From Swiss-Prot, chains A, B:
Gene that encodes it: SFI3
UniProt organism field: Phytophthora infestans (strain T30-4)
Protein name: RxLR effector protein SFI3
SUBUNIT field: Forms an unusual trans-homodimer. Interacts with host UBK.
TM segment ranges: none
Function of the molecule: Effector that suppresses flg22-induced post-translational MAP kinase activation in potato and tomato, but not in Arabidopsis. The perception of highly conserved pathogen- or microbe-associated molecular patterns (PAMPs/MAMPs), such as flg22, triggers converging signaling pathways recruiting MAP kinase cascades and inducing transcriptional re-programming, yielding a generic antimicrobial response. Does not suppress programmed cell death triggered by the P.infestans elicitin infestin-1 (INF1), or by co-expression of tomato Cf4 with Cladosporium fulvum Avr4.
């Protein structure tokens, strides 16, 4: 759909699959750091809420 | 830091940890879809490239 249009532009641009894999893997790594952030956000609030409630 | 300002706001808003966890959980699932879409993008290009190189 949108992706066939993507593949045609990548192919026109002389991209090989190896090249696309290395760039997309870096994107994927950045995405996965967002999961880590939402976890840290949650645990931080869990601790904050608990600390507020105690006092 | 930034987050601590969020926490004070969430706490003033009466959010509990259980409530935050479930809302963040659904958002987390959405982000997990992106990494998977990128893996699918890589895989679909490998197939498209491989097919184009057939001709």
């Amino acid at each position: 759909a949108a992706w066939r249009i993507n593949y045609r532009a990548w192919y026109k641009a002389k991209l090989t699959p190896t090249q696309v894999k290395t760039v997309l893997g870096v994107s994927q790594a950045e995405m996965n750091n967002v999961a880590k952030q939402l976890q840290r956000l949650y645990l931080g609030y869990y601790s904050f809420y608990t600390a507020m409630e105690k006092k």
